[PDB]
Nucleic acid binder design. Structure first.
Lengths: 94, 162
RNA sequence: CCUGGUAUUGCAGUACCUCCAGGU
C-alpha cells in the first residue's frame, strides 16, 4: 500500500454521532494540511471507520506517522493509506 | 505579510468538508490578527493554521464565525473581550501553540457557546490538574482535546477548586 | 438527544444506522 492522499482510519469509537465525528476528525487533522473531505458512514459495514482526504500528499504521510494510535474519544486510532484513490482526488487531477 | 484587506480578498474561499463557509488564511506568516472587517462576517470557519500569530485577539464583531482553526502558530495569550466580538464561537482548535500557564486559559470562560476545545501540544498541557482546571473554569466545553468531558471529571473538578 | 451497559475491527462516497434498559 503506497502513500496516498487519503488515509483510512479504523478502531474508532462508533458511539459518536456522525456529524460530530466528522467535525472532530476535520479539526484534529487540520494541523497537517488542508483536509479536502471526509467519508464516514455508520452502516454495519463501515461503522468505526473514516477516510480523510488531504490536498497535499506530504500532509497525509505526516498525519499517518504522527497520529498512529492517538487516543480519540477513548480509543487508540489505527491509520493506514487507503487501498484506492478517492473519487474527489481523481476528479481534481483530471 | 500583514493580514490585510487585500490579502483576505484574494484568499481561497470555499465550502468545507463539514459543510461550512470557510476562509483559507494558511501559511501566510501572519504575525497579528487584524482587518477582519473585510470578510464582512460571511464565514462560518476561518483557518489560520501555520502562521505566526502571538495573541488570539483583534477581532471585529463577527456574528457568523463559529469555527477557528489556529494550528501551528505561537499563541501565548488569549484576549479578554472575545465573547463581545465572537458570540457564537463554538469550536476552537489551538493545537501546537505556546500557552504555558493555566491562568492564560482563563479568558475562554467568557465564550458562552464554546463547546469544542483543543489545546494539545501546548506546554500548559503538562501542568498538574490541567484537564480539571479547564473543566471547572470553562464548563461550557463538552469535548476537550478530543475526549468527552464526563460527569465524574466535572464532580472531581468541583471538589478541587470549589 | 442524554445515562448505563452491550455488539461489531469492517477499504468508502452516505435520508438514517448495533442491541438492551432507563431519562427527556
Amino acid at each position: 500500500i503506497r502513500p496516498n492522499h487519503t488515509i483510512y482510519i479504523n478502531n474508532m469509537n462508533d458511539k459518536i454521532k456522525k456529524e460530530e465525528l466528522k467535525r472532530s476528525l476535520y479539526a484534529l487533522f487540520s494541523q497537517f494540511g488542508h483536509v479536502v473531505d471526509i467519508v464516514a458512514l455508520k452502516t454495519m459495514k463501515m461503522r468505526g471507520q473514516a477516510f480523510v482526504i488531504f490536498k497535499e500528499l506530504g500532509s497525509s504521510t505526516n498525519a499517518l506517522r504522527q497520529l498512529q494510535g492517538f487516543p480519540f474519544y477513548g480509543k487508540p486510532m489505527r491509520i493506514q493509506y487507503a487501498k484506492t484513490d478517492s473519487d474527489i482526488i481523481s476528479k481534481m487531477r483530471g | 505579510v500583514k493580514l490585510t484587506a487585500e490579502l483576505i480578498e484574494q484568499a481561497a474561499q470555499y465550502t468545507n468538508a463539514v459543510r461550512d463557509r470557510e476562509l483559507d488564511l494558511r501559511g501566510y506568516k501572519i504575525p497579528v490578527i487584524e482587518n477582519l472587517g473585510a470578510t464582512l462576517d460571511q464565514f462560518d470557519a476561518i483557518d489560520f493554521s501555520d502562521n505566526e500569530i502571538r495573541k488570539l485577539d483583534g477581532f471585529p464583531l463577527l456574528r457568523r464565525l463559529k469555527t477557528l482553526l489556529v494550528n501551528n502558530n505561537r499563541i501565548c495569550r488569549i484576549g479578554e473581550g472575545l465573547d463581545q466580538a465572537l458570540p457564537d464561537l463554538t469550536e476552537l482548535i489551538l493545537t501546537n501553540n505556546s500557552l504555558v500557564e493555566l491562568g492564560d486559559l482563563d479568558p475562554l470562560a467568557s465564550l458562552k457557546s464554546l463547546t469544542y476545545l483543543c489545546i494539545l501540544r501546548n506546554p500548559v498541557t503538562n501542568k498538574k490538574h490541567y484537564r480539571l482546571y479547564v473543566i471547572y473554569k470553562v464548563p461550557q466545553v463538552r469535548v476537550l482535546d478530543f475526549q468527552k468531558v464526563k460527569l465524574k471529571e466535572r464532580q472531581e473538578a468541583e471538589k478541587m477548586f470549589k
